[PDB]
Symmetry: C6
Subunit: 180 residues, 6 copies
């Protein structure tokens, strides 16, 4: 069977509580289910992620998908849950080796072309990821904001193809710009 | 490809936050998903855009239509998203050459005849468009309001066919009144 | 094509905003879609219009109906939108020549037999139609209330067949009784 | 044709406004639509009346029933709309001659088996039916409250077949208020 | 005829209002419809009744059930409507002699297996049953609370099959153990 | 037959009322019904439990599931109802002997891999289970919180297979950490 456990961060107040996106593909009819108290802003990432995956020259599963963005108590608010979901889908469809996601935290928003967009309130997530020793991968638009941290384990990408190539083969991504 | 990008502006308060209308025509059955936090454009812009496209002697895709409006975490209020969405559908269906959509914004609401009615609070959009060096193509009913600025590279249109010809061809569209 | 426009009024407070009912018949399956922020009272006019057209010895289209009500950002409240919509459907289905609907403004709801019924707050609509020099056609029940103002160029009908006859061949259509 | 115009009264505040319950059996698949701002306590009248009409040895049409009860903009709120709706449905089915509902106002809900039940706030309906010159009909349970007025033309009954007889062949409901 | 009039008591304020649970069984496709102001806790009772009936080695009809618990204007907020509904459905499909429900008031919910459970605020129901001289039947768990009154004629049971046998044959379920 | 009961606790106020979980597998089409006053956080457990059962190398019933968690008046508002539901489903589908669950109480949510996660406020459940003398089984993440009571019979586990072996085979494992 195939299931993937991607990591990310959700901000509640000042602390970015860890969140564990958990995709799981079944053999039933091609539905799409999201649980874990997903707010409307994050409950509509279904079609957005579908388009961002199809447009990046990938195979979007024709299978019963079931995302589980939850510790079931915490409601999810931000819009940065598209990159974790897309990478979880790809990893659970065997298009990405699941061992690449060992210790990475992904935060990003996907357009309909696969291009990544900048989420808001990124600093708490970067601080939490640094404190947890995890690698963080964010959209280019947040590179300027996260440059202050000066943490050497943060990478920024332009689109989903960049992140997929980095995970599968490690093409160096883009690092973060120098501290101001 | 079947992916098109368009630009418009949503007015919250006094600022006109740029919006990125993204249309992606998939291969499934007829659908018109409109992700992005639209309130009254959700289920109303669909039918107006469909009828305006059909009545202007255009092919309406018999596919799964996914429309994603600008930033995900930004409620979108006005009714002027019919022209950007219609042009995005036409571009994604190749009925318009999308290589000429880069420098132009679009604002307006479409009737069922393909005619362009006048949206409210338009001058902020003109200011923003000129600041960014973009052509702003608005409905004829807002020509009076747009003429105050006298900004060059701004235009106004009677119906959707006028704009589609101004893009496919290069016919001068309407210009603006000199300064009534 | 199968596309007809009608005019009516929407009374809020002391001002009767102009509303342009727009009807389009497409080739899809049977359906009836309203647009323009129509409230429950307005949005429930579908069945009333259907039965009023059917019982008046007219032909109700089997096509997909699509009614767009005037400005897309103005909620519609009154119940007098049944007559404009019925006339729009008949005009779009070629049952009526649509040149007659040029300068007239129609108000008044429809019973299930095709007979017209009165609607509250009719004086502002009469005033607005007077300022625009538009032939107003209202339900016969509203004659006893409108005629007190002694305003001419306003005609009152009892059933949809009467209005259709007046538009097709100018068969009188009664008139507001003397001020008495 | 298939149409019927029953009558009843709706009580808001102290006054009881006239409410013309109307029916139209259109050709098509089985269906049932209750137009006219009907609240839930009226919207279950669908099943209530269907069961009453199949438990009173009557025929329930297999046609697209369309029960409109206006004035449309009046928020019907009571629950004694089952009897007028059932009578109108029967009349539109040519089971009850429609020449008998000319001067009869009906009130009182229907039990699942056919027996009429008592609705609250009946006195204002009695007062209005007195100030219209109508044969007001109520459930037997309301005889105690109708007696206080002592008015005539206030016949009452226990089940549907009692009131169907008072209309078709067998007159003399013979349940006038106990005391003048 | 597949009809059954069971009875129960609804408690609002201090008085236990009478409730007449009425069940019909049409000849259509399988369905289920609860009529009246059935609150959430009541309308979920459909599956509870179905499971309790199936597990008790009874026969669940494959018909278009239609449960109506009047009056239609009194909210049914309690949860002890499960047992009366199950008994009515059984009696409708010639599974319980209808006559045996002559003067019995049933209160208490069910589980999937059919075992009865206690309900809150039982004393007023017993007081009303004594006043109206009905053979009240309550859940076994409610026996302890229904002792302070000390009224006779009140029976208790744990399984729905016990009540079915008592109604069909008569087995003296229990005797409401006395108090000092 | 295919009916299985499981026990758990819901914290309402300061007390942990028992919540009997009941699972019924009918013969109809594949479905899933959660009867009882279950909030979104609880009725979103269908997908979680299905995925946890499938991914643990178990068999998920291809039947009309019907989950009831009584009483039908307590607003079940916890987040650790997934483990009792999964255990009940497995027992109902003759996958776990039903005699094992006769004395144990279960708590803890599930992931899409079957691993158990830590619910909030486990202490009241431990206190109530000790008072009633039931073997409480909780997720490993709650071991630290459950250690500060000193009560034995608080065995823990990491995934569904662990608890299944604990019941089926008897591989008792894990326990409260010493007594800090």
């Amino acid at each position: 069977m195939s299931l993937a456990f991607t990591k990310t961060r959700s901000t509640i107040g000042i602390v970015a509580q860890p969140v564990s996106v958990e995709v799981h593909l079944s053999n039933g009819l091609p539905s799409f289910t999201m649980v874990g108290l997903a707010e409307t802003a994050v409950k509509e990432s279904k079609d957005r992620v579908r388009s961002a995956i199809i447009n990046s020259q990938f195979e979007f599963p024709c299978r019963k998908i079931t995302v589980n963005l939850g510790p079931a108590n915490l409601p999810k608010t931000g819009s940065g849950f598209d990159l974790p979901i897309a990478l979880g889908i790809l990893a659970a469809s065997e298009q990405i080796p699941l061992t690449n996601l060992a210790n990475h935290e992904f935060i990003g928003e996907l357009a309909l072309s696969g291009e990544l967009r900048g989420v808001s309130a990124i600093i708490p997530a970067v601080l939490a990821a640094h404190k947890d020793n995890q690698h963080l991968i964010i959209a280019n638009a947040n590179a300027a904001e996260a440059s202050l941290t000066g943490h050497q384990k943060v990478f920024t990408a332009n689109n989903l193809r960049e992140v997929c190539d980095y995970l599968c083969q490690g093409t160096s991504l883009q690092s973060l710009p120098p501290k101001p």
